Design a protein around this nucleic acid. Structure first.
Ligand SMILES: [Cl-]
Ligand SMILES: [Cl-]
Ligand SMILES: [K+]
Ligand SMILES: [Mg+2]
Ligand SMILES: [Mg+2]
Ligand SMILES: [Mg+2]
Ligand SMILES: [Mg+2]
Ligand SMILES: [Mg+2]
Ligand SMILES: [Mg+2]
Ligand SMILES: [Mg+2]
Ligand SMILES: [Mg+2]
Ligand SMILES: [Mg+2]
Ligand SMILES: [Mg+2]
Ligand code: NA
Ligand code: NA
Ligand code: NA
Ligand code: NA
Ligand code: NA
Ligand code: NA
Ligand code: NA
Ligand code: NA
Ligand code: NA
Ligand code: NA
Ligand code: NA
Ligand code: NA
Lengths: 46, 119, 65, 81, 56, 194
RNA sequence: GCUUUACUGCAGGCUGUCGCUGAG
RNA sequence: GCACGGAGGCGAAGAACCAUGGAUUUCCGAAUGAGAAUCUCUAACAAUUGCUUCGCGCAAUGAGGAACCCCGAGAACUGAAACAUCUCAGUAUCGGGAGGAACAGAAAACGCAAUGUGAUGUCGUUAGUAACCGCGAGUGAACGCGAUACAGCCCAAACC
């Protein structure tokens, strides 16, 4: 497919939201990313 | 048009307006259809002018027949703004009544005659 | 911090602009040092640089430039 | 108002371009054209920009590969920052 | 041809997409109309009383 | 003595006789060639207009609207219906043509508000009404002690809420006693039974 | 759901009449 | 900040924090220069209107809102132990629109008929009364009264 500049921005954001809760955040909160999205098992919008 | 049953020659209309102008300065004139209607009804009208470019025509339809059953003479003018200017207004006028002419009672009286003859 | 509001108002319209472009540069170089994984950082400033820039722009607006 | 240049894009590949092709790499505002990038870059580092290549990245930012003239030395321009 | 699984293979057509006005993946790119907010059809926002129980 | 206006009124008591009859026969020819809403410089029935609030002043507007004659232009049922609800031909709208006319005019002038309206006749297939609209934002009106009331916010879209003279009569609010049990204060608060 | 000379109605078609609509 | 890490920083130049007012406030969005799945293309109140210096010069409308409110369109399941009028119900749902509340409102009223009452909402009652109805099932007011709150005016025309 041919993605537009805006679609590309959205996909970029989704990839970024796909990172893990940083280690230090665990220590800072004395103790999960519920928005984890696999490319195969999940489906993005549009 | 529907209330106009005879055509007034250009020259006659000029004499009429002219007379009207000397009437506002020397005698008395009523400007406006409501004030004119009352002249004819009160009998104080000597010569009434009625424009022919009045829209709606309803505003002046009654002048003719009313003038007839009151003896009052009437003359048609083509331009509404000419009658108003002649009467001394900055705006136009659908009808005017020379309420007792002035230094024109002669030309006036004759204009009434020319029209009566114009049938 | 190192740059107070009084000091910004005691500047001439031209000094704020000169000071403004100066802070932007410090900022840009801090980001470059950061982009290069450079550790000689001091987090408190790259944050102060932003606020200082905001103050100056706020004052330039209040004064009419 | 947004600024043209955001920061130098420094990665292994950017180094090779700098050391072997006299090019500098930046993260610029995605609303910036090659021309705006060329100008902004010259005015900030006092150099002569010969060519600019751009790319809208999968990071959501724009990347510009700016080649400098033989008169300028990328290696040096980048070392002062 | 089976109307089930075998007919699922030809589905590579893009219709509903992220809507510019409401953010939902309901902007039908073929019709240029959002099935969720009405964008492209109505200046007013799409909404109906049957979207909730009658007395609520 | 009789006002000049009284003559316009008297002529319109019988639009099918005298000079008026001929004017109409002439006018309608041009009207039938005009659009749905035509702004006119002067009211066809000056007496009626002034009587309803018209003033030769800035911000006062008049427009003639034509609307088809007859019952509801209704589509037949496309699902189950008991005999009582299967009609099409004899069903008529509860809003009179004059009111339809007022709304079509107001929509044409989104910034103006309807003051009142009156009939100017009809031919075999349509009726004409002239609507008087007012510019609530013009200072010549905001300073008129007789019309400024129409400038208040609660008067916005008055025609669409039945606050018009034709609206109120058509709502059954004419009578103050017997017969208005289901109309006053509103049709809706009375459960929609008038 | 379907049918018809089942019951009752509703579109639609035909036809008279009134309005548009006037002169001899 | 939630958020208790690491590093670093700010605060007696009175920070944090709270109140009020101000600044900033990307893009799409009624979305308004034009086009577009939030981007793009070469000055913009697009569109409809009022005024008009007839020039977008001065203005209006658009869309939102928990429900309430006003004006239009308007079912069926159901009840009648079937069903057609009736009933469910002017309900559900749909179209248009206002406000902080709407709407109504100073009698061509009432009609305890009077030597009487005196704008309008609403609450209590009048009363399941009068009235409607395959006179079946069902449906269903008002005047008055006791309260709440109270407020009365402007045009058109005559004559100028
Ligand atoms: Cl209105
Ligand atoms: Cl009483
Ligand atoms: K039924
Ligand atoms: Mg990655
Ligand atoms: Mg490219
Ligand atoms: Mg199938
Ligand atoms: Mg109420
Ligand atoms: Mg646009
Ligand atoms: Mg039953
Ligand atoms: Mg029975
Ligand atoms: Mg009922
Ligand atoms: Mg009663
Ligand atoms: Mg007065
Ligand atoms: Na996938
Ligand atoms: Na970056
Ligand atoms: Na309007
Ligand atoms: Na009724
Ligand atoms: Na069946
Ligand atoms: Na803000
Ligand atoms: Na505007
Ligand atoms: Na203009
Ligand atoms: Na039953
Ligand atoms: Na049954
Ligand atoms: Na019945
Ligand atoms: Na009593």
């Amino acid at each position: 497919g041919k993605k537009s500049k805006a679609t590309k921005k959205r996909l970029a954001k989704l990839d970024n939201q796909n990172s893990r809760v940083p280690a230090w955040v665990m220590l800072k909160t004395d103790r999960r990313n519920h928005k984890r999205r696999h490319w195969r098992r999940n489906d993005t919008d549009e | 048009p529907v209330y106009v049953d005879f055509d007034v020659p250009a020259d006659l209309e000029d004499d009429a307006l002219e007379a009207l102008e000397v009437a506002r300065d020397t005698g008395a004139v009523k400007k406006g259809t409501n004030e004119t209607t009352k002249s004819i009804e009160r009998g104080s009208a000597e010569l009434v002018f009625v424009a022919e470019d009045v829209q709606p025509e309803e505003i002046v339809m009654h002048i003719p027949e009313l003038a007839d059953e009151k003896g009052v003479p009437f003359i048609f003018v083509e331009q509404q703004d000419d009658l108003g200017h002649a009467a001394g207004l900055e705006v136009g006028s659908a009808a005017a009544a020379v309420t007792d002419a002035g230094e024109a009672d002669a030309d006036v009286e004759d204009i009434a005659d020319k029209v009566e003859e114009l049938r | 911090t190192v740059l107070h509001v009084q000091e910004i108002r005691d500047m001439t319209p031209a000094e704020r602009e000169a000071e403004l472009d100066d802070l932007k540069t410090e900022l840009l170089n801090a980001r470059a040092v950061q982009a290069a994984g450079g550790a000689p950082e001091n987090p408190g400033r790259i944050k102060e640089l932003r606020k200082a820039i905001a103050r100056i722009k706020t004052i330039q607006g209040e004064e009419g430039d | 108002s947004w600024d043209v240049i955001k920061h130098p894009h420094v990665t292994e590949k950017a180094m090779n371009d700098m050391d072997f092709q006299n090019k500098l790499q930046f993260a610029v505002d995605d609303r910036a054209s090659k021309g705006e990038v060329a100008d902004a870059v010259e005015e900030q580092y006092d150099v002569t920009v010969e060519q600019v290549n751009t790319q809208n990245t999968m990071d959501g930012e724009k990347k510009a590969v700016v080649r400098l003239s033989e008169d300028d030395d990328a290696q040096e321009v980048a070392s002062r920052i | 041809t089976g109307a089930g699984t075998p007919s699922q293979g030809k589905k590579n057509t893009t219709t509903h997409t992220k809507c510019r006005r409401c953010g939902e993946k309901s902007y039908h790119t073929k019709k240029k109309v959002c099935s969720s907010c009405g964008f492209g059809k109505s200046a007013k926002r799409r909404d109906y009383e049957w979207q909730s129980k009658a007395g609520e | 003595a009789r006002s000049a206006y009284s003559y316009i009124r008297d002529a319109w008591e019988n639009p099918g006789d005298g000079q008026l009859a001929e004017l109409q026969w002439q006018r309608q020819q041009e009207w039938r060639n005009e659009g749905a809403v035509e702004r006119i410089e002067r009211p066809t029935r000056l007496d009626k207009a002034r009587s309803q609030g018209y003033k030769a002043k800035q911000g006062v507007i008049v427009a003639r609207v034509s609307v088809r004659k007859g019952s509801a232009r209704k589509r037949r049922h496309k699902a189950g219906r008991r005999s009582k609800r299967q009609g099409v031909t004899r069903i008529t709208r509860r809003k009179d043509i004059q009111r339809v006319a007022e709304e079509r005019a107001s929509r044409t002038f989104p910034n103006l508000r309807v003051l009142n309206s009156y009939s100017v006749g009809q031919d075999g297939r349509q009726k004409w009404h002239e609507v008087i609209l007012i510019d609530p934002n013009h200072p010549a009106i905001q300073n008129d002690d007789d019309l400024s009331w129409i400038c208040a916010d609660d008067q916005a879209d008055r025609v669409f809420r039945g606050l018009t003279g034709a609206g109120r009569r058509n709502r059954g609010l004419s009578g103050k006693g017997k017969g208005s049990e289901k109309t006053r204060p509103s049709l809706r608060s009375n459960g929609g039974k008038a």
